[PDB]
Symmetry: C3
Subunit: 298 residues, 3 copies
């Protein structure tokens, strides 16, 4: 795209504020931002807010979201689809033109770990170029295992293909498959989907802790066989709904866009790989690390 | 196949009749029929009854099926395997020769949404050429959410490959991935697996309705990440068995041959896409549309 | 690998012995062994004990495993990762050098059907070359359907690629996808992952029996759509945990490394194919046979 040559729009912080007991404002951008997806490999990504996957959104079950998208892309329209919400796609997930803004309002009435992404045709093109992310909806009644959890993080899996190549997007194997982590609390890492950051700067935990991960596989195209090496998942909630409760799973199958809340105990000090057990994808980047110490600090 | 050159056997209606409180007769054909799978693209499909996927079969839990296959193919033997039934495959799923008929009897003792397909070696060849379909077995006790459902439809996902190309069937990506709908009640659409019909003539519903879809991914080769845009599944019954109950899923993973009953509410007027969220497959045709109006008519 | 030319190390029996009410010793080898994966096709596999998948391990819930790996490979280090155990991967799943042994101890505190495999970087290379297997952990309280089961077997699905070809391992379709069976009781077959043995020498059962299969899809790369032709699964326990209970499934989705306990009834004499319903993989070898007779013997 000629109008994208040399364009590298600096990341813009997500804006969110509560405006009522059950109403939340969210303002995001669509923007074109260079991301290092593998060492020495820059992808001029189509992004929300200059991150790919986009920034983490967290709301409460029953919140109505008043969402504004500011399209900074000079030529390509973009839109937003939240899997959390009940909305009319042809009225509420519509395109925002370059240099314009649009505001859309819809309720998040289901708890869980939901994908969000651009919904502009061809959707495959917008997702593959980087316009994906996660919104977490916190259950009103929590999860039955809340009291057991010591520490929590968010992980997202995505693929990267040849740059803006629709033939490759449809018909080719992914060039990279990657994990990223998005911050829930101050001090948490906030990273982009790349092959290396969560290996070189592992997530941190303490010996004996029960860890919760909020996870989603945004695709665009692959399913995920999510596994933490050296442990077993004590409890799994499919899509993050507290009713979809499994126990003692070694590996959790996630469809494309599929989410889960998974919980596991780390019993010994060491470094614990986190993989998709589809090992062609792991080899192409989809390995993160969890470093477990006696004190919890690196 | 030389004996298939110029052959286009007109579709023959499914024949079914109840013969006892727990016994049902079903008569189907195997036939060679041209189907437009994408605009301008004719596939000379191997079919049951001139449809691909084949005609919908609905029976009651506990029905014994007395099934007759009339093979109209001039040269290729075909057979029938119903996933619903308990049968001896080497006695009851056997080949029927060209221009012959065979009758086989077996019970459907489990509720759900089951694949059926030809079971003639190489099975991949018969399925990929179009010999797949769905049989629904209605639960004796229903589903716990029956009283909430306002409207229902059947959707089937399948792939199409290069014509009768076993190398492509085994080793290549699908050329098209498609949805079709099969009629449950008079007035429902009844379509074949193509890239366009359910976009141009969407399924219809009314604002506020809870919709049930009986779904199955017949493959032959891909798994499906089934998702309705703009809603969340309130309830999901894996394989259509009422015991396999999930709630609040954004997306339902279906193995090849996997089925489900999914239920969701459409809260606003508009058009709601229905996809496999493996977006390479969606881009290659696997998007249907649900049009929701204030009155339910187009 | 030059040091592997002409190397064909004869299979070595698994060594196991109980050393306390909750402690079990296991001794395995890493060795280089020629396996006929398809008729006329020898793969010089990287193996545990000269089998691929490796020998079956069965322990009780709550057993601590004292595991020794003797590395017979002349040049390549190998390691062991059991999905059953809680361990520090960077301390307990570490490499054993050629011609050395290492001993590692860790508890199996969860019931189920778990993958094991080499954990040496690049893990994809070690798994794809054949270093995978299953460990079964028997639940302390059993399964609720134990009293209904008449006969049981273990089945494992794996893929084979071009020989030691990392490009193919990461980016290519599998050349073969295969089932193998591992013995639980004297007289059970014990086979390697190949395209033919379980077709030519089917598993055996008697008319009317309820069969339990302990299954795992070790990959490395594909998911599995596990289906027994001519029946429906009465009960399914995902990953073999008794709590993850589904009923009446036609087909069970298994992620890469995913396991299950599945149970089904064979009502009539005949031969029942066992497949992954991803039929490209079935065509490339992933069909086993179950022969059901009036007397249960061939
Ligand atoms: Cu507002
Ligand atoms: Cu976009
Ligand atoms: Cu979506
Ligand atoms: Cu704790
Ligand atoms: Cu009859
Ligand atoms: Cu056929
Ligand atoms: Cu089948
Ligand atoms: Cu209603
Ligand atoms: Cu010991
Ligand atoms: Cu190895
Ligand atoms: Cu593993
Ligand atoms: Cu019995």
């Amino acid at each position: 795209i000629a109008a994208h040559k040399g364009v590298n729009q600096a990341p813009v912080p997500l804006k969110m504020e509560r405006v009522g007991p059950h109403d939340v404002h969210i303002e995001m951008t669509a923007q074109i931002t260079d991301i290092e997806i593998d060492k020495g490999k820059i992808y001029k990504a189509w992004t929300f807010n200059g991150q790919a996957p986009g920034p983490l959104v967290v709301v409460n079950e029953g919140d109505t979201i008043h969402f504004t998208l500011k399209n900074m892309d000079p030529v390509v329209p973009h839109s937003m689809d939240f899997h959390a919400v009940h909305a009319s796609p042809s009225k509420d997930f519509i395109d925002v033109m370059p240099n314009k803004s649009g505001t859309f309002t819809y309720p998040a009435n289901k708890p869980g770990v939901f994908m969000y992404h651009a919904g502009t045709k061809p959707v495959l093109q917008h997702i593959a170029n980087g316009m994906h992310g996660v919104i977490i909806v916190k259950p009103k009644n929590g999860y039955p295992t809340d009291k057991e959890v010591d520490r929590e993080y968010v992980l997202i899996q995505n693929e990267w293909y040849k740059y803006n190549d629709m033939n490759d997007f449809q018909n080719g194997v992914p060039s990279y498959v990657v994990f990223s982590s998005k911050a829930l609390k101050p001090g948490d890492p906030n990273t982009n989907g790349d092959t290396f950051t969560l290996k070189e700067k592992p997530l941190l935990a303490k010996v004996g802790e029960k860890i919760r991960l909020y996870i989603n596989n945004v695709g665009p195209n692959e399913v995920s066989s999510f596994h933490v090496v050296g442990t077993v998942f004590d409890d799994v909630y499919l899509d993050g709904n507290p009713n979809n409760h499994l126990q003692g799973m070694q590996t959790v199958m996630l469809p494309a866009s599929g989410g889960a809340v998974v919980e596991f105990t780390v019993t010994r000090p060491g470094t614990y790989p986190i993989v998709t057990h589809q090992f062609n994808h792991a080899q192409k980047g989809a390995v993160a690390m969890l470093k477990v110490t006696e004190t919890g600090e690196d």
